[PDB]
Symmetry: D2
């Protein structure tokens, strides 16, 4: 209805990609960025070159303390304290909280105190903060809610898949495994992970298949109450720049042939979930989804059925890119709604 | 009872590792090797240096056309036709068929025609050749069977896991996913796979999560009839030198707590299956099993249960090393039995 | 002057990229492709998806035995014998010989017998076949020469660098080292390289720094006679999808400051060699050049000088992309000249 | 003369490996370890499992706040302030300063204040702290010097190589390039490096060839005055667990054939520098030196000569393992001398 003004806290993989994903958009625009761990010179550099998604689609420069993207000026701050960021001065409608250390309503509030209208945590909340997944429950958003969560990359991939299958065949119970690409919280060589938590994530990322936990499957139950308590899963970190794959093993109430389930998913991908859920029958591999903007693409040939009620369903997702575009979709939605 | 004389056809990852794994052994010894794709000089080189398991634990040299391991002589041939290999002259009790292109009883017979007493296919058979898994059904071997199969690396990992769980809790149905390390049949850069079969395996192995199929789960039913038709699964090839991880999602007849299932497995690992099945509660990662000689090590902390009858069980395995030691165990067994 | 009709023999990394690089071009177009190791279905797949350069910028399909790129038809053959390819019927002005097994004038002749006007070997010749490097000696091409070589990726990178430095400061002698990205001739796991030649290239590409030889530096002397016998070097294969870096250590006749040499190169990159030689002072890394169409980009900050006559100069190059664009530049040139 | 008591500050790649390398030794033993970034439980874990060098050659456990290696007790501390570590109570003869943040005489002094007799910085000093390289100048050590530096992994590789070549042929000038394996100071995904220094090191380590600087070559001049000002070089970080390769391009005073230079090096490797400098003519690759305890192994076949005075010499080194063993050699030396 009118260009949404976005503010970004934490200019990392997600911060920068959300920024990159906004470039095309004509319904949203980033006007402010905050990150106390990079000078303006360092920030332009990081935004300009990317080891996964290529160089920035435009010229990046800075002048007088502003970030210059073509002929637009973006304010840049270096506040370690969110409450200290002049979001208000910049007329920020929504702040993309993507530092990964303010995942609670009390912590994410400081942005509102700084003048920001609303806030979106680019990760699962540690509080009972409302969680939303585009194309799944975003239409159940209440404008009075000023702080929300866009969930996790994995939840965004599994959620759509789960809804379609449950909606028609009904999911009795399911277990999920996601082979996930490398992430910023990992180490180059064997070392101690932060807070001595999840020791495995401190092991050399270059040569290991690394077991990790994830609440993505249980989170689905929060976005789809009908599924609360019917799903859970694990993760396996692998040495891949980007693109992860969800592997859902489920039991359905109503019997079906793999072909029928596949057909149902395809129908959703071309209809109501077009743009969120994708469908394919090609012999694809992770690299094929690098920079794919969908939340999840069903891989028909990769999955299979043991019998008429026990299935193994596979779906890919660019954990970085898809998620970043969704953050923008949610930002626009909760501002014009 | 008396040193088993082993012959190796196909001196590749498995051929060389079986050879390496025999070095310590005092009940078996390799006396002949055949591979028409490497001169003797090239063969010593490959056997001496290994990018995964380190250098050979002894000095490797050649003289007068023989392979010299210390002060032992090993005959070396370069026959493309198995029937042309003088196994008899070398008194070969068993031939480790590990070229991957003679996986049928008719094809593997040529070794018997060459003078070899018995043969073991280092891979699943394409015929109804008898399949054996150490510690699972090897005691059901019939001496009159001259050609057998040691199965696949994955089957050897999943089989023990399946038996213990089924034996006490009973497995109604199960689906499996194995994240597998890179393999010789893959390509360095995107290209056409052999015979235009399994296109995905021709995609760059360095940067892809590659979906692949596997009959390992169904094979379990062949080694454990009670499980025929109750298991199947898929694979995901990843960029790892060695070590794969089996991820079994199963439904049990009798309810149980994750702890009880874990306890049952541990009991087996320390008792009847000691040496085949391992157990651990440490925060491990793939690299931790490089060169582990067991067929499968249960990872207690990596798995979990959705409810009292739906479980996700994880077990690691060095696809190269463990399998190779098993080939030797089977070789000795079917020769002294 | 008029659209050049290109034929491609060997639809591999270079074949497909040359094809991809021609898509934009309005002065050249591919009308025929030959590769006996992929069915038409397999060929579309490989051309459509790429693990390095992304998906094809257009829809790829096939119908009635033709390759369909939008609404253009490209003939596709599967001849193992080059002389058997109907280049003439397709009016091929130039054939991009990129299979890597017909690098001699006698062998590359078969294309002329098939009806092709001229031929370009996408690699160094093993004969005294004429070698050309765009922007260096291509203007010394003789139209009566029907078979030529576009040289090697490394030569194309080093050649421009060498000319500029020699032209002004004069190179007395130089040694070069190129850290090269992985290549099709390498193996996923330790095995025997073809013909038992260059054993090192058969070692696991995923985890090794692999020493390899290269005539790229000596080749420079063939394209720049003034430098014959003044340069040579070695290579180091590393696990990188694409992008290699040339590292030239040279001694100049006339003294200079690193700044002056840098300035000279910059001058060439913005003047006479614009498009072939690039210049930069940014803190770049290999990934930054993925898909860069230049033959070599000088890295000012990466190099240095020991004294006024001994220098270490660094320059990057996308071994796949840049080279492929050059093949097109040469194809057009020798057809309209 | 009598078991040297070693203390380790910073239980990282080097800390743990020095500890691991001491296990066999009968002339030195670690009695204390300090690292405030890992609980005792976390420390045992990290010491027990290693993604590069395998599992610890003994059982690792902890009891009553001590590290238990078999039946030996090692005190463990978690002081962020070195001066606060009770080295004296533990009778520490030498402290292996390997945190990488106390590389100055003033900073490394705090250990002496804590009761430690002497100190060795496991890295190049930022002060004019004395630098020593085993087999090169360690016999010029003065017992009154309480703080010294064992130099850098690269210097330890290049130093021996340089001495032998200079001693007989004389090095006029030389430039060096080391392709180096990944290091702890690098990042898994593109991010900001510490202090905004060396931006390149913050780029994804998984997929980049990363240009880096190094004073290793100039440092050689400090250990070998005769070479001061005659050498310098650059580095290239690559995705390799461990093992780097030094590539020295040098000009000699006295002419020679590659064979003679190779012969000279071999002579040193088997004589005076045996154990420090290695020699080989095999087609080796980085993985072949994983866990090699030598400071540098000359690779005869990898190098070459342009003419009788201009050479390119290659030598490998396990940046982690060799260096760690050297730290122990120096520790014993300066305590019994
Ligand atoms: N990378 C993925 O695949 C992916 C996918 C979906 C969601 N996410 C995530 O989004 C979040 C961020 O992850 P990321 O990959 O972008 O990590 P990242 O480390 O690349 O980015 C985090 C940024 O936070 C900055 N920061 C730290 N403290 C700050 C402060 N006080 N104020 C402002 N900035 C601060 C850092 O300097 C950094 O640039 C995580 O919670 C994670 O769940 C990541
Ligand atoms: N690498 C693993 O992860 C793993 C684990 C368990 C089992 N296996 C396997 O065992 C088999 C062999 O695989 P690998 O990893 O050793 O592959 P590999 O490519 O390393 O070894 C195959 C060998 O076959 C040789 N060969 C080809 N044709 C021949 C012929 N006619 N006569 C004699 N030798 C011939 C080749 O030169 C090569 O040395 C496969 O079927 C596979 O299932 C592999
Ligand atoms: N990849 C690079 O970085 C790079 C850069 C510059 C030059 N080059 C090269 O150009 C050449 C090709 O290498 P590539 O990387 O494309 O390798 P590739 O293996 O990817 O492609 C070669 C193609 O040749 C085909 N082929 C084999 N025999 C054939 C025949 N008889 N007729 C028709 N096709 C046949 C194969 O099926 C394959 O598709 C090499 O000589 C190499 O020097 C490669
Ligand atoms: N990895 C190699 O290839 C190699 C080779 C030779 C030398 N070195 C080095 O030796 C040094 C250490 O590097 P590394 O690879 O072990 O890095 P690392 O990061 O693995 O280890 C450093 C340790 O310092 C600890 N630490 C931080 N602050 C501390 C404090 N105040 N007190 C005690 N401990 C503290 C960290 O927790 C960590 O365990 C570096 O300067 C580097 O040059 C590394």
């Amino acid at each position: 209805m009118a260009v949404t003004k976005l503010g970004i806290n934490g200019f990392g993989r997600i911060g920068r990609l959300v920024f990159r994903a906004a470039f095309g958009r004509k319904d949203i625009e980033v006007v402010a960025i905050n990150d106390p761990f990079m000078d303006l010179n360092h920030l332009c550099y990081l935004l300009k070159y990317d080891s996964v998604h290529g160089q920035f689609p435009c010229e990046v420069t800075h002048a007088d303390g502003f970030l210059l993207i073509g002929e637009k000026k973006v304010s840049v701050f270096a506040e370690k304290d969110p409450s200290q960021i002049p979001w208000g001065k910049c007329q920020v409608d929504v702040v993309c909280e993507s530092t990964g250390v303010f995942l609670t309503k009390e912590l994410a509030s400081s942005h509102l105190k700084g003048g920001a209208k609303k806030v979106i945590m680019s990760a699962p909340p540690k509080d009972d903060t409302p969680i939303y997944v585009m194309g799944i429950n975003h239409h159940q958003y209440d404008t009075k809610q000023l702080i929300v969560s866009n969930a996790s990359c994995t939840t965004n991939c599994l959620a759509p898949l789960a809804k379609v299958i449950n909606d028609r065949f009904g999911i009795v119970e399911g277990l999920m495994t996601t082979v996930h690409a490398s992430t910023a919280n990992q180490l180059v060589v064997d070392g101690p992970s932060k807070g001595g938590k999840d020791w495995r994530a401190g092991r050399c990322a270059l040569s290991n298949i690394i077991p990790a936990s994830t609440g993505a499957a249980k989170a689905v139950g929060k976005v789809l109450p009908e599924l609360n308590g019917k799903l859970t899963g694990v993760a396996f970190r692998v040495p891949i720049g980007t693109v992860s794959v969800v592997d859902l093993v489920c039991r359905l109430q109503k019997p079906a042939k793999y072909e029928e389930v596949a057909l149902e998913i395809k129908k959703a991908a071309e209809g109501p979930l077009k743009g969120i859920l994708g469908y394919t029958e090609d012999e694809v591999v992770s690299q094929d989804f690098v920079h794919d903007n969908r939340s999840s693409i069903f891989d028909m040939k990769a999955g299979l059925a043991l019998n008429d009620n026990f299935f193994k369903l596979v779906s890919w997702y660019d954990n970085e890119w898809g998620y970043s575009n969704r953050v923008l979709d949610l930002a626009v939605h909760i501002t014009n709604n």
